[PDB]
Amino acid sequence: VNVFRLEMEGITVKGKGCPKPIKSWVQCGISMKILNSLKKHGYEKPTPIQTQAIPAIMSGRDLIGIAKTGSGKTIAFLLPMFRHIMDQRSLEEGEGPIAVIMTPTRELALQITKECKKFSKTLGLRVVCVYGGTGISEQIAELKRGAEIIVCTPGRMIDMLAANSGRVTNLRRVTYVVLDEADRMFDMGFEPQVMRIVDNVRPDRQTVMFSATFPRAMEALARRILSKPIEVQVGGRSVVCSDVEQQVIVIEEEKKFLKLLELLGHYQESGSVIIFVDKQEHADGLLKDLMRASYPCMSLHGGIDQYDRDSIINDFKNGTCKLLVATSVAARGLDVKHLILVVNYSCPNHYEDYVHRAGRTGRAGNKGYAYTFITEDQARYAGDIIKALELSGT
């Protein structure tokens, strides 16, 4: 029932027919060797980019993932590919790899080969040992004995394809095409080499691309080579609106009412504002304290009747009530044009309620103000609030 909490963690997902992210590597549909390598490497919890890319690579569809530096994109490209190679074994033909990994640098290709050897440890699968600027005879002797994956330079791959040392057959040769640092491969320098690498490939083969940054033109150039791609970045799915300004202040539980009274008294946050509370009794007490302080305020919660809540909503929409106290039920789905300010005095336990409270004000391209009071008790939601502020650009 907590499938929405994995998507709210902050992982923009785009595409049709996207599988659910896995919580751990033990229930991700991986083989025994990949799980043994993950247990030997010391991975207790998987990365969110890895949890978004591993079912998309296990399902057999094209995926394009973007994340920060050092997030584990090489392991996220090597582990489901090795799991699909171990689960669906094929005949190791001559001079034909089952996977093609493209790296723009020789040191990056050597690091990808070392990561693939560490992910395929305690097994007979040796992928590749080749780099640019070295002896081609040793690389040909290493590739002639058997090659599972092909992680090298595009120039070395073009030289191997021109000298008939390595190529992709038409019927069944490779099933996955990995592209590490796809922003550099889609540039003007590596365009015809990547075009000749993608042209001489099998028709029934998946294409994977991973990079730290991704421009619009590079993504538009890379989307033409893939067939129905699935995008995975951060953050978009269940994220806060960028048009509404978010503010977080560190105050106590008793000082929150004084901060709200100072924002209503000194600043212009009293009129046309929606105040989110934790419970209905606390919202009624805050509404009574606002009405006792010579300020017109209305309240809408589950403890009140439906007609009184409708009258309070009509008074907030018409302009009769300056402030409107509401619970978490009115945070999502409410589309009021008068709600310009969103005062979150009580922080919710879930980030989706805070995202719905921030998105309730300043919609349809308009600006908005959102001020939330962060306390010491909401320490678990502070990381989610920081991730939402980093995704929304606040």
**3 state DSSP class of 28:** coil
The angle formed by the CA atoms of residues 290, 292 and 293, to the nearest 5 degrees, is: 65
CA distance to 54, 294, 352, per residue, from 6 (Å): 14, 44, 11
Which method, experimentally, gave rise to this model? cryo-EM
Q: Which DSSP state fits 21?
A: P
Burial of 216 from C-beta contacts in 10 A (0-12 / 13-18 / 19+): exposed
Label the pairing between strands 273-276 and 13-14.
Answer: unpaired
Report DSSP letters for 97-152, one per residue.
-SEEEE-SSHHHHHHHHHHHHHHTTTSS-------TTS-HHHHHHHHHT--SEEEE
Peptide bond into 235 cis (omega under 30): yes
Resolution for this PDB entry, in angstroms? 3.0
Q: Hey, CA dihedral for 30, 35, 76, 139, is it positive or negative?
A: negative
> Which single residue is written with the structure tokens 């592209």?
179
Count CB neighbours of 31 within 10 A: 18
Report the b/e string of 78-115 with b at 16+ CB within 10 A: bbbbbbbbbeeeeeeeeebbbbbbbbbebebbbebbeb
Residues in the annotated binding site: 67-74
260 close to 292: Cβ distance less than 8 angstroms: no
Residues in the annotated binding site for ATP: 67-74
Q: Hey, CA dihedral for 231, 233, 237, 243, is it positive or negative?
A: negative
Report which of 217, 208, 203 is spatially closest to residue 169, judged by C-alpha positions: 203
139 close to 130: Cβ distance less than 8 angstroms: yes
